[PDB]
Amino acid sequence: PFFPPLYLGGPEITTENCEREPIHIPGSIQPHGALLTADGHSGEVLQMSLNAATFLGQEPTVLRGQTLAALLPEQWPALQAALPPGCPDALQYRATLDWPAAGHLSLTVHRVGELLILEFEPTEAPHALRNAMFALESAPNLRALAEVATQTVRELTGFDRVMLYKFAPDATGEVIAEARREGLHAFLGHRFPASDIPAQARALYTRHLLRLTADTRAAAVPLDPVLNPQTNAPTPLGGAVLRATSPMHMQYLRNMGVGSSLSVSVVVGGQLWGLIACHHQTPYVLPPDLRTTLEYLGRLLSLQVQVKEALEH
Amino acid sequence: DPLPFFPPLYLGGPEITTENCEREPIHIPGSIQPHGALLTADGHSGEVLQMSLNAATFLGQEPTVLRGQTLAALLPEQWPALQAALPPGCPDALQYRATLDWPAAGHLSLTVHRVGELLILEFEPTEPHALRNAMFALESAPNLRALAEVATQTVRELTGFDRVMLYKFAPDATGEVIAEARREGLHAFLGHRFPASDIPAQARALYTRHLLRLTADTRAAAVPLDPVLNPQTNAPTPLGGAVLRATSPMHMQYLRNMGVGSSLSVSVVVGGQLWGLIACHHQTPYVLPPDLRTTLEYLGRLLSLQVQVKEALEH
Ligand SMILES: *C/C=C1/C(=C/c2[nH]c(/C=C3[NH+]=C(/C=C4\NC(=O)C(C=C)=C4C)C(C)=C\3CCC(=O)O)c(CCC(=O)O)c2C)NC(=O)[C@H]1C
Ligand SMILES: *C/C=C1/C(=C/c2[nH]c(/C=C3[NH+]=C(/C=C4\NC(=O)C(C=C)=C4C)C(C)=C\3CCC(=O)O)c(CCC(=O)O)c2C)NC(=O)[C@H]1C
Asked: Cα–Cα distance between A166 and B23 in angstroms, integer?
């Protein structure tokens, strides 16, 4: 099963119970964005991140009464149609708001049962993606495909190190390719145990395909209330990219000397084949539109991995 | 019966009938569609060899001036990028794309690929979260039918085409419209079935490698290359990888007979075989700009993946 989260007086995680930490219900988010939850029917704002006032420019109480209808007039009917009751928690809808306080915000919404989860992040506003797609397709074998993928991602993102991590049948890991800035250690060829990406983590990475930590020293921002009014239970955040990253897993990025990280899951035959793993030495908020490019690349790599593995077997 | 290609018309080959369907060399027509321009150049020196006859009017230069310069001089910023992206021995399927600001012609899209020692350069005029939203909707479709319907409707919304069908090949290469989105008033093709020779086998092989072709105007005359043969080889210039390459007159006649002014399709490729086709119709001529066509190319790949996934959920 899982332990209760901390804020419901559950045990503090260790290296003894690595498999039961509820990474999907931390009750908090990373501070480079803001999150609201809301009722599926009424559009009634039920929870907000204590930092919402910053991004939205709204007097705190104003929000926690109001309706999405009021708050987002153009958007609220689109949401209603895009995310019908009963849809999967994996389905997401995005829009760009030209919002008074903040030039442009990206809005990302998904639905978990009766709750809409809304994420707001700063945003903005060429051929590198098309060029990359053809490059991946003409790679002659899996090894070269891995090399092209890591190089392409590094060029698109500027990340200090981009690896292709591959899981063995027992969940043992292997960096099989790596693109990195001069003057970093080389993790190419190394392996790591199946514990280092635990079992509920690989389960969530199978369904929600891109997760990231923007600053390994930033404090999480609580949800208020912490419990969903609807249920008097924890809000599932597993499909939110803003959802707080396990302090366990941030402590290990710090011990490595990483200040910003990001992965895209590579899913083949319904299973987690491997990750596109990116490292930055300093804090780094990759904007939403560039993340989208990596999300596309994730799908394309998933296709090409199968194609390429089929021409060996 | 499968038989080798005839020589093209310009090398004294025969004209094409219902008898000799399978034997047109559809890849080497010696000509392009008039809404863009094409140059060929030597892959090592960058000497310009062939050009479409309309090139002066896209590129704003006399032929003899174009042909008298190397790509190093014509494309000083792109020439080194081309050479890195398209190394000798690379496959003909690999494409490099850039946008140019050309004085006389505005923003041009440049698409380049390499066939042996030849570079082929295509120039076309070029011009929010719809793709991301579509990607997730496709993935959440519960079964093959719902996927097919979401895919057709999405493509129609993105493009404005009068008719978008998903066309699926059977094992005998007969096909069948399994989903479609269509303009009000058009008659349905859904569930119809069409004989194998409707898409003959020399073109199904080509659609397994080069995943997007179109006819922008089914009455437009093709524009010859000049000279017609590659001076490197005194042989035909391979245009199977060029979206501009002129479209065969037997195909063009049939689209005309169906009342179509504009066509397009992306291939859906599963396990190395052509599974089907996102076919698009418009009643009037219609040019879809290169950046919009890129969205369809990306959807072609997504759909190939999702078709595998939906079919595996099915035994
Ligand atoms: C006692 C718990 C441990 C633990 C937990 C844990 N790990 C993740 C996710 C990841 N762990 C990774 C480990 C590596 N990072 C590397 O750079 C390398 C190799 C060079 C390895 C083996 C990786 C890559 C991930 C994926 C996430 C990412 O970095 O982008 C989680 C899940 C966190 C979340 O879902 O928010 C958890 C709880 N990992 C351990 O190694 C032990 C100490
Ligand atoms: C003697 C040869 C004949 C022939 C020539 C020919 N046809 C193609 C390609 C296509 N034919 C298609 C037929 C259909 N169009 C539809 O709308 C439907 C159903 C609703 C069918 C069955 C299709 C879809 C294609 C593919 C092209 C596209 O979709 O855009 C070619 C190859 C063209 C080229 O690569 O240059 C040729 C030479 N067509 C015949 O019917 C026979 C008599």
From this structure: 46
Asked if residues A264 and A298 have their Cβ atoms less than 8 Å apart, the reply is yes
The alpha carbons of chain B give a radius of gyration, in whole angstroms, of 20
Residue with tokens 């404090």: A219
Q: E strands along chain A, which residues?
A: 28-29, 34-39, 45-49, 93-99, 102-112, 115-122, 161-167, 173-180, 191-192, 210-213, 221-224, 227-228, 233-234, 260-268, 271-280
CATH-assigned architecture of domain A123-216+246-313: 2-Layer Sandwich (3.30)
CA of B197 to the centre of ligand 2 (A): 8
Per-residue CA distances from A301 to A175, A304, B140 (Å): 16, 5, 19
- Between chains, do B140 and A91 touch, taking CB under 8 Å as contact? yes
SS3 call for A94: strand
By C-alpha distance, which of A178, A87, A125 is closest to A289?
A: A125
Residue A305: phi, psi to the nearest 5?
A: -60, -45
For CA atoms B277, B281, B286, B288, the dihedral sign is negative
Identify the three-state secondary structure at position A280. strand
Phi-psi region of B237 (alpha: psi -120 to 50; beta: other; left: phi over 0): beta
Q: Is B21 within any annotated ligand binding site? A: yes
- How far is the first Cα of chain B from the last one, in angstroms, to the nearest whole number? 33
CATH, domain range B1-125+219-247: 3.30.450.20
Quick one: which of B34, B24, B30 has its CA closest to B10?
Answer: B30
CA gap B148, B276 in Å, rounded: 11
B312 in contact with A at a CB cutoff of 8 Å? yes
Q: Which residues contact A192 (CB under 8 A, 6 or more apart)?
A: A172, A173, A174
The whole-angstrom distance between residue B232's C-alpha and the CA centroid of its chain comes to: 25
- Return the CATH class of domain B126-218+248-315: alpha beta
Q: Tell me the two tokens of residue B37.
A: 């321009």
- Smallest CA separation from ligand 2 atom 25, residue: B199
The structure was resolved experimentally with X-ray
